[PDB]
Write a protein that binds this ligand. Structure first.
Ligand SMILES: C[C@H]1O[C@@H](n2cnc3c(N)ncnc32)C[C@@H]1OP(=O)(O)OP(=O)(O)OP(=O)(O)O
Ligand SMILES: C[C@H]1O[C@@H](n2cnc3c(N)ncnc32)C[C@@H]1OP(=O)(O)OP(=O)(O)OP(=O)(O)O
Ligand SMILES: [Ca+2]
Ligand SMILES: [Ca+2]
Ligand SMILES: [Ca+2]
Ligand SMILES: [Mg+2]
Ligand SMILES: [Mg+2]
Ligand SMILES: [Mg+2]
Lengths: 159, 165
């Protein structure tokens, strides 16, 4: 993998299209505007940078894995206080192109988030291995196949 | 009056881009996507459209009128053929959507995304309202459509493939 080491976090609201259809566009745009503000504030708290939005989810860059995980922990807490979000985190080298990130580790991060349940923070093995002392605990992981990748990958939920 | 303004939204997406990336390596991938970005941007510009955002291996694009969106898709599939190896799915839907900065929000954005997701590599699919708006086109031709259900939406939708000359 090429480029600089970065931690990439993806959020994704569960079943947001059905929600949009149920409440209508007026209520949806109000909901997502508030969600954007929330995510943006919590990202900034852990020194992250939002790269882009898919409307109901964000791609976010952090320098350190504990920053990303803490952001995720705070987001889940805030949401608990109705939408559910899945969060995936991976780290590794990726290529900076403009203000965007490219490469297999970006795709890997997206695939990890896709595996996450609503309300769950899932991290890849390298993220798990990099943490411990940081006030963060994990489960024992689950091995899964990821589309586009040849391996099987053990993904760890934050407890 | 209705919430949101009329716009035609086109999504593109490279088929199996992750496997491609893994095969060719990040250096080659960045070169490829850089080239792809420029091709799409140029073709969108020629039809007076606007690229809203990049989604890594595809784009969200806005146009004022459906003929422009469809023409853009036709030229892109044409250009990709000439270049050929990447296959791109294209989906087009039209309706009202809410503007926020340079982005667009609402259910019709989600519908356009799902129309693109139903499309095969190398195919351009459009929703019925796009097909219906272009019933009078002397150049744009469609198949007879196929019925689908779209993630998040109730009921059935008929999606139509563009048949290019
Ligand atoms: C909301 C659904 O439509 C897509 N979408 C909507 N607005 C935008 C936008 N401005 N930019 C980009 N994409 C947009 C993103 C999202 O897709 P999904 O996440 O696939 O929909 P849903 O949340 O219904 O499905 P799951 O997450 O449950 O699979
Ligand atoms: C695996 C997912 O990663 C997405 N991705 C890669 N780079 C970026 C980026 N810079 N910004 C946003 N998203 C990015 C694109 C890819 O999505 P898919 O299109 O779901 O993956 P693939 O093309 O592998 O499979 P199909 O389209 O065949 O499902
Ligand atoms: Ca979602
Ligand atoms: Ca793709
Ligand atoms: Ca669908
Ligand atoms: Mg999604
Ligand atoms: Mg894509
Ligand atoms: Mg449906």
């Amino acid at each position: 993998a090429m480029g600089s080491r970065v931690v990439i976090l993806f959020t994704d609201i569960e079943e947001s299209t059905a929600l949009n259809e149920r409440i209508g566009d007026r209520a949806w745009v109000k909901l997502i505007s508030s969600h954007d503000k929330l995510v943006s504030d919590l990202v900034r708290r852990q020194s992250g940078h939002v790269v882009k939005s898919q409307g109901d989810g964000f791609m976010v860059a952090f320098a350190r894995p504990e920053q990303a995980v803490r952001c995720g922990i705070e987001l889940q807490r805030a949401l608990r206080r109705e939408i559910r979000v899945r969060i995936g985190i991976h780290m590794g080298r990726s290529v900076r192109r403009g203000d965007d990130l490219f490469g297999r580790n970006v795709a890997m991060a997206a695939r990890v988030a896709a595996q996450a349940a609503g309300g769950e923070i899932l991290v890849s093995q390298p993220v798990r291995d990099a943490l411990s002392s940081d006030g963060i605990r994990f489960d024992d992981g689950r091995e899964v196949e990821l589309k586009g990748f040849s391996g099987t990958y053990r993904l760890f939920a934050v407890l």
